[PDB]
Design an enzyme around this catalytic site. Structure first.
Site, PDB file in Angstrom:
ATOM      1  N   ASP A  35       0.842  -1.196   0.000  1.00  0.00           N
ATOM      2  CA  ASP A  35       0.000   0.000   0.000  1.00  0.00           C
ATOM      3  C   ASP A  35       0.879   1.248   0.000  1.00  0.00           C
ATOM      4  OD1 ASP A  35      -1.903   1.914   0.285  1.00  0.00           O
ATOM      5  OD2 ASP A  35      -2.410   1.406   2.374  1.00  0.00           O
ATOM      6  N   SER A 199      -0.452  15.588 -12.009  1.00  0.00           N
ATOM      7  CA  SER A 199      -0.676  15.230 -13.396  1.00  0.00           C
ATOM      8  C   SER A 199      -0.920  16.490 -14.217  1.00  0.00           C
ATOM      9  CB  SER A 199      -1.876  14.287 -13.488  1.00  0.00           C
ATOM     10  OG  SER A 199      -2.269  14.060 -14.831  1.00  0.00           O
TER      11      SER A 199
END
EC number: 3.4.23.22
Length: 330
Positions: A35, A199
């Site tokens: 994770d 992004s």
């Protein structure tokens, strides 16, 4: 040193991925959910409340000659899906894919919430976010990667998750055969303890690319792709009959649909998520309403590049003094 381990979807939907991990002496192999959005290595154990164990493999520290109670240390964690677990702490030897760390904090669960009990395939979590998020008190503990870093050939790990197929976590090296083209690296902020990056935009299907900054986290422990409501609405508007359902808890679409791809920007590069990766199947057995793999982050407080996005790429988690993320097509 290096390590290399195969990671395998837990079910036909890629709801999560499990990677075998050797703990203790002699080894006890548990299948952990790696994770990158949390920083605790915790396991089902001989200390877990018996009614909260249902098929998981447990770590029994009393059977490990290298286990030592970390006296006074406790841990307690809550995840973004509302699940939680807590317990005490041992140090022990932990190996992943041939890479061994001695003295790793292994957090033994005394209590786990129902969603963990109900998932017999996940024996615990191995956190790979920054150690500043580790929950052990009163002495915060380091992640497996943080402990291994100095010994690694290169201070990196990579995630190569499969679509409906196994993939690979590598530690200490970048497998240049595992991706196509070049890796584009992008800056990371560690201010929230995550692999947080920005992004450069998105496209829906064959549509034009929209240049827009989307701050979010690379999170292997989250199944879906959670993005701003504007972006998600633009995606689902291209699917006839798709709608956001408050009763189901997100966007659903007709199971008869063919989904468009979704592209996200990494610097000047582009990662394309095929439409099929966005199909999470019937909302309930036999339903013709299917659950979407791109969902709004509006209720989370952070955008999450979960497995839906990451499995479309070869992803480098660069833990150099100034961390960065790398993405390549594959």
């Amino acid at each position: 040193s290096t390590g290399s381990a195969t990671t395998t979807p837990i079910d036909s939907l890629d709801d999560a991925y499990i990677t075998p991990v050797q703990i203790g002496t002699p080894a006890q192999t548990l299948n952990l959910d790696f994770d990158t959005g949390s920083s605790d290595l915790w396991v089902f154990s001989s200390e877990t409340t018996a009614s909260e164990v249902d098929g998981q493999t447990i770590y029994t520290p009393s059977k490990s000659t290298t286990a030592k109670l970390l006296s006074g240390a406790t841990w307690s964690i809550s995840y973004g899906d509302g699940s939680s677990s807590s317990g005490d702490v041992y140090t022990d030897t932990v190996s992943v894919g041939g890479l061994t760390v001695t003295g790793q904090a292994v957090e033994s669960a005394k209590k786990v919430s129902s969603s963990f009990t109900e998932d017999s395939t996940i024996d615990g979590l191995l956190g790979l976010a920054f150690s500043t998020l580790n929950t052990v008190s009163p002495t915060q503990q380091k992640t497996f990667f943080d402990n291994a870093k100095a010994s690694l050939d290169s201070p990196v790990f990579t995630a190569d998750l499969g679509y409906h197929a196994p993939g690979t976590y590598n530690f200490g090296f970048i497998d240049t055969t595992a991706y196509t083209g070049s890796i584009t690296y992008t800056a990371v902020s560690t201010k929230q303890g995550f692999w947080e990056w920005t992004s450069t935009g998105y496209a829906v299907g064959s549509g034009t690319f929209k240049s827009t900054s989307i701050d979010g986290i690379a999170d292997t422990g989250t199944t879906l792709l959670y993005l701003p409501a504007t972006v998600v609405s633009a995606y689902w508007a291209q699917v006839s009959g798709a709608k956001s359902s408050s009763s189901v808890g997100g966007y659903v679409f007709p199971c008869s649909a063919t989904l468009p791809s979704f592209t996200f920007g990494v610097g000047s590069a582009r990662i394309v998520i095929p439409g099929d990766y966005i199909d999470f199947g019937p909302i309930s057995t036999g339903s013709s309403s299917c659950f979407g793999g791109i969902q709004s982050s509006a209720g989370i407080g952070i955008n999450i590049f979960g497995d839906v996005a990451l499995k479309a790429a070869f992803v480098v988690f660069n833990g150099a003094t100034t961390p960065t993320l790398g993405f390549a097509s594959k």
